[PDB]
Amino acid sequence: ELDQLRQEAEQLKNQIRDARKACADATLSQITNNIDPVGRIQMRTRRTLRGHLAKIYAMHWGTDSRLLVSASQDGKLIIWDSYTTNKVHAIPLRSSWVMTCAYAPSGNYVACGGLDNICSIYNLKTREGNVRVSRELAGHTGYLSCCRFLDDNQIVTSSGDTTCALWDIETGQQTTTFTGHTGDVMSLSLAPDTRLFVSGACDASAKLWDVREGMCRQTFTGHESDINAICFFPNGNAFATGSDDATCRLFDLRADQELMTYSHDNIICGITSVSFSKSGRLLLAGYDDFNCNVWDALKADRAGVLAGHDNRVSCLGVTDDGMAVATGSWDSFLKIWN
Amino acid sequence: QRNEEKAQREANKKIEKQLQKDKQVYRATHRLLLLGSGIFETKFQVDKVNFHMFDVGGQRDERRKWIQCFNDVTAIIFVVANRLQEALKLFDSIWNNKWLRDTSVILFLNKQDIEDYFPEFARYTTPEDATPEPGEDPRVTRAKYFIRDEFLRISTASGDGRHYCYPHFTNIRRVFNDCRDIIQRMHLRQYELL
């Protein structure tokens, strides 16, 4: 049956291609050409958080824009007060190889997972005042590459077995399992309304899911190598990706196709972390090289750099109020740029 | 408000005291990746030195992503068992990885009593400096040293002295001595003297 079933899908995928070529009538760069550029945007390291023995892998701002949780290969998860530089908690982990960390939108829990395939949920506001693991979501057969909280009960996790999964922390078993990727999924990002979430994997494909129905709405294939980072536009009707192709691309959920690419010939290092500013005008992208670029997300022209890490930038995140941009690196130091 | 910031700055003071009692135990232990439930840890101790060997058990056979985690590791223990050309092509990737370019690779070779997969073996004669242990023919010694010279073709073609391969034949004593040679050559390299 594969005689025809594999070749007609090439015609089926082909009639999808020209449908996207029928929508492309004016590139994003041409539309934004009239808009006056932002010039040079020079941020400087306000805070430099220290105390991590090993390279940081992920950080996540709290919704209050003050606290932030950083995960390191040392096996320590630390919550910092970006304002006073003080450390609030120093949660020690069982498995030292944690490749992700999340901060609940209520500030009550933090998650972290990695090469142990487990997603541990740590309860901060406990009755004894300390911090300990509440649940260990053990249902994945590969490493955990991303973790995002929807509520204090629903957490969607991206794993290295090509599957994302929606969980229920009060029970501990997967409410939904998202399948469709052909490579280990590297990052996800929840939508502003938390009804959908895009997800990038090592097959150069980004898939827009639906948390409720558990299906795959759209699939975006514009990159050429492993997509390492993904982030939703603050509007919720677009998202940006960063791959080992040394390029960033802005896809559109309503146009189903790529709108703009953010590449330069001087950069050959793959983007390792992508985030948007509060207005969605800047696209802060971390790189294999220590410097992190700042892209005018409308004009694709670079508008600044943050070359202070001195090591590969593992993570990157803008606050909800858009004040600071905490960047984490394998140098073991998390720098706040305003 | 000045008082709760004092209580906060005391919590940072109790934390930084624990982050210092952990920095000592972190620098004392030496990580080891054993290449070949998502990860298994073996904690052995040779001469009161804490070694932590981490076997990637439940991970898939696509390593291009989770292998980058083990770059700060002391040595990548690489056990070898066309299962041989697959290990030569894997070692060539562990060696020529930008992240693992500074990571030495201890290498073990299991062999018991080779021409169909490698034709140069009909033209390879064991070097005279090879010392065979008594108890087996000089033909497997010609085979044990051909594979060893196949991994050193990759170990020497690249690497300006940042990482070193340590091939062996098959315990924990050889990993202990090889880890000492890895750190000593790292200190000498920092002083720029070699």
Partner: nanobody, 126 residues
Framework: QVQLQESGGGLVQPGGSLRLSCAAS????????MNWVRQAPGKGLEWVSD????????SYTGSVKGRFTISRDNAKNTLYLQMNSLKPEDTAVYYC?????????????????????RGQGTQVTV
């Protein structure tokens, strides 16, 4: 969309000669180190050959040395494999793999068909 649609292959008598092509699209062909892997009937995938993005840096497996020859045309985005002196045990499905990241010297292309930047394969029966 990284599409590696190869051609060639079929049925040849033992001792014949084939020429496997590989029309690559969806990526800058001149930045990636291309490969050739095959899956023998009843066995896992094994690596056959490769070639660096420079154009002249070639490696083979021991059993195809002297008989096979890989060559790429960056100006046309095509990868070839001139097969000569076909042995009976050299029958397999030949995939036109690609190393994952550009401007690198390491590759992880034999990964139990779960590799994404690979072709569908061409049957070569001898």
């Amino acid at each position: 969309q990284v599409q590696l649609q190869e051609s060639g292959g079929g049925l040849v008598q033992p001792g014949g000669s084939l020429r496997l092509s590989c029309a690559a699209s969806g990526f800058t062909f001149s930045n990636y180190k291309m490969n050739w892997v095959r899956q023998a009937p009843g066995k896992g995938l094994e690596w056959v050959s490769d070639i660096s993005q420079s154009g002249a840096s070639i490696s083979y497996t021991g059993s195809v040395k002297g008989r096979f020859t890989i060559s790429r045309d960056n100006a046309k985005n095509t990868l070839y494999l001139q097969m000569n002196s076909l042995k009976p045990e050299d029958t397999a499905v030949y995939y036109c793999a690609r190393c994952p990241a550009p401007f690198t010297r390491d590759c992880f292309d034999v990964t139990s068909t779960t590799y994404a930047y690979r072709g569908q394969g061409t049957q070569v029966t001898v």
